[PDB]
Write a protein that binds this DNA or RNA. Sequence first.
DNA 1: AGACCTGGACG
DNA 2: CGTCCAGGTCT
Length: 263
Amino acid sequence: PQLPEVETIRRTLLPLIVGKTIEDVRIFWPNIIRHPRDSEAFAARMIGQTVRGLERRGKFLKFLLDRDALISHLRMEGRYAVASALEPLEPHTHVVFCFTDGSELRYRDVRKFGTMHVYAKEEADRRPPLAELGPEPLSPAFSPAVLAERAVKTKRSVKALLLDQTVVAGFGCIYVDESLFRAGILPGRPAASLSSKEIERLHEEMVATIGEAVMKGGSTAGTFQHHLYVYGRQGNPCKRCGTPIEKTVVAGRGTHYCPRCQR
DNA sequence: AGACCTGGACG
DNA sequence: CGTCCAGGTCT
Ligand SMILES: [Zn+2]
């Protein structure tokens, strides 16, 4: 999940958990728990607290409790649902938070890649993983100046630049590829080879793409996949020029682009 | 890369 | 059967 997907999980999950009080926390795959590293301390400190809110920072979910904040990263497969304690669990359910009202927040993750960190609220933003994060793309803090400051300094591909969460938070392969297309820029271009005119353009497209995806509930629930120009369309005609979309490897990752529209 | 991980589209 | 992919991030 990327920013648009997570922002959607955030909007729909909040009303389902807000004001509930944790009675128990049950863990079935401890590796998910990263801080405290001991999964028993993790469970213990949360018992008794009440969900006060739910925020998003980059690709992370930030559950706001009483004194603590829980930082959850879904990675590839992480999924949350709220259900009755009286029903059997779905498979691949690794962490369950039991509330006093008989309902449960269930976390599922087939590949077990996801992570959970719990800190005191005041500590969350100055500790891993939130600390190194770049500006929110839909915030004024994300500007062409910001993008340019990082681009000139590096020799790596513009794709690799935008995937770096320290540069800007929220983009993954899908939306990076789409943004680059919309901005007419080849993914493999050295970041530094970008001009001021391209930087501004890319910034406008990055903001627009992520914005529309969020309004459309993301890609699959979501509907933004009907609005994909290049991702997963390899071999198919470009929607703008009819050139077959191409797929190669940029920075070790499957990359999609139109060889005509992008330069 | 290869790491952690599990499973679905491929012949 | 296998291998080849997969919307993350780390080493
Ligand atoms: Zn094209």
